[PDB]
């Protein structure tokens, strides 16, 4: 006899109501009501909001038809608009964007001139050999890094001075007397990205006086490079051939590894945390991916010390027999 059956399947809906025809007027009128105001100012509001719609709605048919002149019609819109806005205490403070970027340098020092740069240069030319590429590296930052550094810092002077400007001379000012506000954030700016630089190069300083040769031989220490140049080492078509599609198989393995790595590396953190996270949703996709990368990259960097070894003691001499 017993049978529950519930039969009845409730499923009641709200109704909305477009007091309006704008999202101004709604999110402003929805707004109001929920802020809940006295019924004198509900509708005194209710009705100067109907008027600016009109006189809206007014404005930019007359826009299209073309007879607003005096512009009068638009500023009286406008003026309306802010008037009651910060009236109401609607307004607040509208944001203001602005930017010119850069980008022309190109500068052209000596070369081994200042002992600031010889040092360098003669450190590693001499610490071990590193003259040619690996010296001619060290001067692609060393050089890019004084261009960049004192280019930054240019900037940074030049936009200083954008303050007490007068056609003649910056008056007494660390930075231009300023009320706090403006050029604030641009010298902050450039102080960051020139300092961060500055350190990048007190590593390279590091390099050369600690980063002496050590070990290497899995990324593109020599081996990707000695297969790279191999092109220019007196080579054959058919062994080129060879060579060619062999290494875009490898760089791209190896590439492909770094990469695998890296999102690797980002992956494991991200999954490690999402496993605290208390619930258990994106855990099993994710520790599926997860270990399946780690699994691929294991390969690859095995595969990478074979062909190592082997593309290694084949690449030299380079018999006929392709090799």
């Known amino acids: 006899y017993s049978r529950e059956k519930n039969q009845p399947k409730p499923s009641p809906k709200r109704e909305s109501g477009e007091e309006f025809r704008m999202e101004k007027l709604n999110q402003l009128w929805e707004k109001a009501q929920r802020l809940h105001l006295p019924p004198v100012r509900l509708a005194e509001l209710h009705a100067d909001l109907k008027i600016q719609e009109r006189d809206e709605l007014a404005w930019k048919k007359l826009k299209l038809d073309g007879l607003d002149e005096d512009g009068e019609k638009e500023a009286r819109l406008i003026r309306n608009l802010n008037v009651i806005l910060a009236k109401y205490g609607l307004d607040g403070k509208k944001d203001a964007r602005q930017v010119t970027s850069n980008s022309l340098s190109g500068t052209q020092e000596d070369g081994l001139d200042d002992p600031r740069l010889e040092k360098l240069w003669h450190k590693a030319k001499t610490s071990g050999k590193f003259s040619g590429e690996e010296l001619d590296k060290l001067w692609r ?20 001075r954008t303050e007490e400007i007068h056609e003649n001379v910056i008056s007494p000012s660390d930075l231009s007397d300023i009320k706090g506000s403006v050029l604030h954030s641009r010298h902050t700016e450039l102080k960051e990205k020139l300092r961060s630089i500055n350190q990048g190069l007190d590593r390279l300083r590091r390099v050369s006086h600690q980063g002496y040769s050590t070990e290497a031989e899995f990324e593109e220490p020599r081996v990707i490079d000695l297969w790279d140049l191999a092109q220019s080492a007196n080579l054959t078509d058919k062994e080129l051939e060879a060579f060619r599609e062999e290494l875009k198989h490898f760089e791209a393995k190896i590439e492909k590894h770094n990469h ?37 990259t294991k390969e690859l960097g095995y595969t990478v010390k074979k062909h190592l070894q082997d593309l290694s003691g084949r690449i030299s001499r380079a018999r006929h027999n392709e090799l």
């Open 141 to 160: 930052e060393f050089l890019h890094h004084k261009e960049k550094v004192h280019e930054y810092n240019v900037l940074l002077e030049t936009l200083s």
């Open 260 to 296: 695998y790595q890296k999102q690797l590396e980002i992956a494991h953190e991200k999954l490690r945390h999402a496993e605290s996270v208390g619930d258990g949703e994106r855990v099993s996709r994710s520790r599926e991916k997860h270990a399946l990368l780690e699994g691929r």
